[PDB]
C-alpha cells in the first residue's frame, strides 16, 4: 500500500519490494491551523 507508511512510499518509488538502504528524506509534517483570524470594515455597507 503506497500511502500507508514511510517505508511504503520508500518501496513504491524504486518500484521494488527490496529497496536498498535508501535513506530518504520523506514527506514532511505540516502544521494544522489552530484558529482563524478575520479583519475587515465594520459598520459600513456598500450602498446599492
Amino acid at each position: 500500500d503506497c500511502g500507508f507508511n514511510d517505508l511504503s512510499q520508500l518501496h513504491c518509488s524504486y518500484e521494488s519490494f527490496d529497496v536498498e538502504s535508501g535513506v530518504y528524506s520523506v514527506s514532511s509534517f505540516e502544521a494544522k491551523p489552530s484558529g482563524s483570524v478575520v479583519e475587515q470594515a465594520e459598520g459600513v455597507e456598500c450602498d446599492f
Binding site: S13, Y14, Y24, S25, S27
Partner: protein
C-alpha cells in the same frame, strides 16, 4: 647575453624573500533535498490528487538528489583517507621554534581557519534547532534562504563531518609536515624539529649550501614576515578568498531560485493554489492548477540537472585537492607552478567553506648579478682528471682563480671534493695549471 668563448654567463641571485601563494580548491557542494509533493502542491488535497497523474516525476527528482548527496559523501570520505597521516608529532604551543605558526589551534579550529570562516558571508544552517529559530525570530533579513526551507519544501542536509573531526584531520596533517617531508617513503617518520626540516628543504631544492643556512637566522625572520603578511589581507584583492566567496554564493543562488520560483504564476490567475480554489469552479480550477503543477515540475527538474553538473565538477576538484595534498603538503615539489610560484619550500592546508585552503610558501630570488662561469675544470698536466660542480656553478671569483657557488644564492666558496664530481673530459672544460683545487691535486 650568450658568450662566444668556452665560458658562459650566470645571472645568479642575492635574496630569499619567502612568499605565500594561497590557493583554494573546492571539494564539495552543499547537500539539498526537495520534498517534491510539498514543493509543488503546498498541502492542498486537490492539487495532490491532480498530481497523482504525475507520479514518477517526483520519484525521479527525489532519487536523483539522493544519488548526488551519496556521491558528495563518498567524495569527502575518500578525500580524508589520503589527508590522513599514518604517523604524526603532537602539536604544542611552541611548534616551529623560530618560525611563527598561527596554524595551531586556540585550545578545535585554528586562528587562520577561524578568520577564514568569519570573513566569509555564510548563512548559519542551523542543524541543531534551525526549526525553532525560524519562528522565534523568523527571517533574519531580506531573502532568508536558509529559513525559506521549512516553507518552500527543500532542506539543507548536514555535512558528513563535524568541525572538530575536520580540524583533527588538518592538525594531524600539520603535525607530520617536518617528519614525512624529510626522507624517502613515508614508511618511517623521523620526528625532527621544524627548523631542521626547513633547512633541509632550503639546502635541497632551493639550493643554498650549508655555510649560508648555518650563517643566517634572518631566514626565520623572512619566513615570519611572509606568514605574517599573509594574515592581514583576507580582502577583496585576495583572489582565492574571492573564490571561497564565489562558492558560497553559488550555494545561495541555487537555493534562491527554488525559493523565488514559487511566486511565479506560469500564466495562472494566481501563484497561490488556495486563491485559485477560492475563485474558480472545478472544471477550470483544474486547468489553472495544472499550469502551476507543470511550471513547478519543470523548474524543479532544471534545479536537479544543474545540481548534477555542479556535483560532477566538485568531484573532480576533490581529486585535484587530493593530488595537491600528496604533492605539495606531504612532500616538497620539484614541479614549477604546481604548488605556487618561485621554488616550492613548504605548504600548509586548512579547511575552507566547501573545500580546502592551501598556503604555499616558496622561495623568491631578487638581486641578480651576472657572473662568468666555467663548464668544468681539468688539470693541464693530466687532462684526464676533470671535475664538474654538483648543484652549483664554478665561478671566476674577482676577490684562487675559481671558486664554487650554490645554485640558488651567490656566495662563493673554495672548491672541495664535497661540491664536485669527477667527470670525463670535454672540449669546453678549462685546462688550469697554475693554482689547482684540492680535488684535482695528485
Amino acid at each position: 647575453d650568450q658568450l662566444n668563448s668556452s665560458y658562459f654567463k650566470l645571472s645568479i641571485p642575492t635574496n630569499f624573500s619567502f612568499g605565500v601563494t594561497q590557493e583554494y580548491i573546492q571539494t564539495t557542494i552543499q547537500k539539498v533535498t526537495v520534498d517534491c509533493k510539498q514543493y509543488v502542491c503546498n498541502g492542498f488535497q486537490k492539487c495532490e490528487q491532480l498530481l497523482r497523474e504525475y507520479g514518477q516525476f517526483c520519484s525521479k527528482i527525489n532519487q536523483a538528489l539522493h544519488g548526488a548527496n551519496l556521491r558528495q559523501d563518498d567524495s569527502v570520505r575518500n578525500l580524508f583517507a589520503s589527508v590522513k597521516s599514518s604517523q604524526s608529532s603532537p602539536i604544542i604551543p611552541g611548534f616551529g621554534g623560530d618560525f611563527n605558526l598561527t596554524l595551531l589551534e586556540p585550545v578545535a579550529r585554528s586562528a587562520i581557519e577561524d578568520l577564514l570562516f568569519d570573513k566569509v558571508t555564510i548563512a548559519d544552517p542551523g542543524y541543531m534547532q534551525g526549526y525553532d529559530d525560524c519562528m522565534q525570530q523568523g527571517p533574519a533579513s531580506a531573502r532568508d534562504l536558509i529559513c525559506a526551507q521549512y516553507v518552500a519544501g527543500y532542506k539543507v542536509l548536514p555535512p558528513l563531518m563535524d568541525v572538530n573531526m575536520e580540524a583533527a584531520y588538518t592538525s594531524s596533517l600539520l603535525g607530520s609536515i617536518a617528519g614525512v617531508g624529510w626522507t624517502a617513503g613515508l614508511s618511517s617518520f623521523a620526528a625532527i624539529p621544524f627548523a631542521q626540516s626547513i633547512f633541509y628543504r632550503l639546502n635541497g631544492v632551493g639550493i643554498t649550501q650549508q655555510v649560508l643556512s648555518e650563517n643566517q637566522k634572518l631566514i626565520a625572520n623572512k619566513f615570519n614576515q611572509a606568514l605574517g603578511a599573509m594574515q592581514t589581507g583576507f580582502t577583496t584583492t585576495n583572489e582565492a578568498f574571492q573564490k571561497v566567496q564565489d562558492a558560497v554564493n553559488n550555494n545561495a543562488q541555487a537555493l534562491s531560485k527554488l525559493a523565488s520560483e514559487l511566486s511565479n504564476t506560469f500564466g495562472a490567475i494566481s501563484a497561490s493554489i488556495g486563491d485559485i480554489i477560492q475563485r474558480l469552479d472545478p472544471p477550470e480550477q483544474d486547468a489553472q492548477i495544472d499550469r502551476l503543477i507543470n511550471g513547478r515540475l519543470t523548474t524543479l527538474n532544471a534545479f536537479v540537472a544543474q545540481q548534477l553538473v555542479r556535483s560532477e565538477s566538485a568531484a573532480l576538484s576533490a581529486q585535484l585537492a587530493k593530488d595537491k595534498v600528496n604533492e605539495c603538503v606531504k612532500a616538497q615539489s620539484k614541479r614549477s607552478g604546481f604548488c605556487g610560484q618561485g621554488t616550492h619550500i613548504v605548504s600548509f592546508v586548512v579547511n575552507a567553506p566547501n573545500g580546502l585552503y592551501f598556503m604555499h610558501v616558496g622561495y623568491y630570488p631578487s638581486n641578480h648579478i651576472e657572473v662568468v662561469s666555467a663548464y668544468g675544470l681539468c688539470d693541464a698536466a693530466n687532462p684526464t682528471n676533470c671535475i664538474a660542480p654538483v648543484n652549483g656553478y664554478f665561478i671566476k671569483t674577482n676577490n684562487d682563480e675559481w671558486s664554487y657557488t650554490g645554485s640558488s644564492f651567490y656566495a662563493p666558496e673554495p672548491i672541495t671534493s664535497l661540491n664536485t664530481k669527477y667527470v670525463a673530459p670535454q672540449v669546453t672544460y678549462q685546462n688550469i695549471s697554475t693554482n689547482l683545487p684540492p680535488p684535482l691535486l695528485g
